[PDB]
Design a protein around this ligand. Structure first.
Ligand SMILES: Nc1nc(=O)c2nc(CNc3ccc(C(=O)N[C@@H](CCC(=O)O)C(=O)O)cc3)cnc2[nH]1
Lengths: 159, 128
């Protein structure tokens, strides 16, 4: 099964860590918890942002251009990316925008963090059609000393 | 490529302050971070401070936390490092860098993974 995991500001705005105004160590912990020991598929800008492989996960980078780092697996198409994951219970797609758009129709699960922040940006999480999904988990947290904004973890499953 | 141009280095006494600046020749995009590393004679280069260009969020090396403050101005396309309560062991060549690597990772990333670098500015702090 294929899942997407993303952090969304108001109006579904998303972006690279350097672009976004929030600091949410609790969300990073949520991301790690839900991706550890699973393959992760990301686009090239997301790879450039993390700077090194995510530990404890098979790192697969989807790009039309040749790889430039032999520490990770490079693929040129959605089908190649899925094949590179082999036989696993769950594949985690970790963005960014174009990658989310390419995998959404194949996905059966979404892990979303809804952040209470208004952010200017051109990149958005794809319009998922809410009535096609069932909300199976929701957990709200206020901002605190460590976390800059309030946020809500949600898991949705495709009907 | 975009050039990183450093200024502000000099010689001051222990306990003084000094302000370094790094101006990028072309406007940075929101996905970049910009920051400082330093290298003292005979020592390995080490991380000092970084700020995300879009978010304006900061991180510091353990040896300068509390004493140094990094900031950036979007309009002037410049970043500044205000260095206070300087110590002799802060003496080094200071280098500005920029990269798409998340600012949060700069305290542990190998410095050569950053592809944009200034040429270095000397900071000397003397107890004499
Ligand atoms: N809920 C959610 N939050 C995110 O921040 C997120 N980020 C991406 C893409 N960018 C990133 C950036 C950094 C790390 C990261 O550093 N993860 C660490 C945890 C924190 C740390 O140790 O530095 C990890 O091991 O997972 C992961 C994804 C994709 N989906 C997301 N989904």
């Amino acid at each position: 099964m294929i899942s997407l995991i993303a952090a969304l500001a108001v109006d579904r705005v998303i972006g690279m860590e350097n672009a976004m105004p929030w600091n949410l160590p609790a969300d990073l912990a949520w991301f790690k918890r839900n991706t550890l020991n699973k393959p992760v598929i990301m686009g090239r800008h997301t790879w450039e942002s993390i700077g090194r492989p995510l530990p404890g996960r098979k790192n697969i980078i989807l790009s039309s251009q040749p790889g430039t780092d032999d520490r990770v697996t490079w693929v040129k198409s959605v089908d190649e990316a899925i094949a590179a994951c082999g036989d696993v219970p769950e594949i985690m797609v970790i963005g960014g925008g174009r990658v989310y758009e390419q995998f959404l129709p194949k996905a059966q699960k979404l892990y979303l963090t809804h952040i209470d922040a208004e952010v200017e940006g051109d990149t958005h999480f794809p319009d998922y059609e809410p009535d096609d999904w069932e909300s199976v988990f929701s957990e709200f947290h206020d901002a605190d000393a460590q976390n800059s904004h309030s946020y809500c973890f949600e898991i949705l499953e495709r009907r | 490529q975009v050039q990183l141009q450093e200024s502000g280095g000099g010689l001051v006494q222990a306990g003084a302050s000094l302000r370094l600046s790094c101006a990028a020749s072309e406007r940075l995009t929101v996905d970049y971070a910009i920051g400082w590393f330093r290298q003292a004679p005979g020592k390995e280069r080490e991380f000092v401070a970084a700020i995300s260009w879009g978010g304006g969020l900061t991180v510091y090396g353990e040896s300068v936390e509390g004493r140094f403050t990094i900031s950036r101005d979007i309009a002037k396309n410049t970043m500044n490092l205000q260095m206070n309560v300087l110590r002799p062991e802060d003496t080094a060549n200071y280098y500005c860098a920029a990269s798409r690597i998340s600012y949060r990772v700069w305290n542990t990333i190998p410095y050569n993974k950053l592809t944009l670098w200034g040429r270095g500015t000397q900071v000397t702090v003397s107890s004499h």
